[PDB]
């Protein structure tokens with residue numbers, strides 16, 4: 482055949498698919514009807530996301546009481562406590578969560594500890610989740626993770642077994658469902674071949690049609706200037722079920738918007754997937770480096786084995802990191818040199834990977850730039866970038882750049898796990914507001930200026946702030962004109978600010 486098999490793999494594990502996830506996937510089926518579309522689900526992990534939420538609520542309740550019993554708690558003290566509390570709940574033998582039966586029993590016990598209407602709040606959620614899975618199982622497009630691991634274990638039981646253990650660790654030890662998906666996508670491609678995309682990506686569009694309209698005209702590229710706004714307007718015009726775009730607007734002109742709506746209506750905007758050579762491994766790097774959010778290879782790909790092997794090695798080293806209790810600066814070099822010699826690594830190039838292991842149980846709990854998180858180094862884009870470099874895969878022609886999917890969608894800006902909008906003090910103070918803990922004058926000024934910095938950094942686009950930050954801003958008075966103008970401008974792009982923009 483000489484082309485990669487026309488399989489389009491997606492992954493959604495840990496709970497029902499959100500409406501906007503189903504909506505994005507249908508766009509892919511609409512544009513690539515001749516592909517075999519497979520969304521991998523795990524019917525043995527129906528309640529992981531809901532368990533995650535119950536643990537976070539218990540964590541926050543414990544954090545409020547910690548703050549109630551300790552003023553002068555610093556931001557660093559707060560997040561150390563947040564990480565320890567999370568571990569204590571996940572490790573608690575009275576609250577097992579290794580399967581859906583244990584999770585359900587544990588979710589009820591946590592909801593009963595929270596009081597209020599939390600019992601019926603979780604009871605209805607459990608039932609809604611079961612109904613969603615019944616429709617999925619009974620109502621083709623879905624395939625089962627257990628059948629996937631079984632199939633891969635008949636090809637490579639060694640790697641199948643090691644990867645399944647890592648998958649289950651991300652499911653249960655951290656509950657980081659994006660990181661578990663970092664594993665599943667590699668197994669899917671290595672077992673069956675095809676193309677993989679994250680569920681928040683959308684097909685590329687025909688930029689030649691855009692240019693031929695003359696409405697979108699540089700020490701920059703057209704995509705970097707216009708793609709985010711165009712993809713907002715495409716989704717807004719399609720009125721995708723579950724979309725956030727009913728409350729968001731772009732900065733494009735009426736004429737620009739009409740042209741996008743026309744091209745979208747004509748069904749002449751999205752491009753179908755290109756053919757890919759069967760003996761090559763494909764990703765894209767045209768946005769901030771290589772990403773594992775979009776991938777393509779045939780089954781039994783040699784570079785894929787090297788990628789899997791490095792991820793498996795990453796977890797062997799993390800296990801040594803935890804047991805050795807490596808914390809301080811000096812202890813990390815006694816570790817980095819020891820690991821570079823134990824596994825034949827280049828210590829100079831590993832200088833960033835080892836320190837990120839400290840963040841393994843801080844991801845999703847402590848604010849951090851995405852490039853500093855453990856997840857990116859363990860299983861995500863940064864390990865992909867490393868293996869491509871180490872294997873010299875580009876020069877050797879075994880990895881190539883390919884335009885698979887666009888990162889410029891509305892949903893890509895909403896991470897299921899990463900937190901990098903507010904850091905340190907401001908993030909600490911924002912949680913206090915969420916906990917109904919009054920701020921002093923100093924904490925108020927810091928959080929207020931931080932909110933306006935985030936808004937101002939957005940320039941001519943919507944700023945997606947947490948609901949509690951909006952409620953914080955609505956409790957304030959005596960805004961300056963510069964600040965008020967920022968809020969009026971923000972209301973032009975998002976309905977979140979409608980109240981803040983009213984005099």
Ligand SMILES: O=c1ccn([C@@H]2O[C@H](COP(=O)(O)OP(=O)(O)O)[C@@H](O)[C@H]2O)c(=O)[nH]1
Pocket residue numbers: 491492493494495496530658659660662663678679680681893895896897898899
């Ligand atoms: O509850 C979840 C959250 C994420 N994912 C998977 O993880 C991928 C990446 O998620 P996300 O876009 O939130 O991660 P980010 O791009 O922010 O790292 C998704 O496309 C899914 O395949 C999943 O299966 N369940």
Ligand SMILES: [K+]
Pocket residue numbers: 681892893894895896897
């Ligand atoms: K997302």
Ligand SMILES: [Mn+2]
Pocket residue numbers: 679681892893894895896
């Ligand atoms: Mn994403």
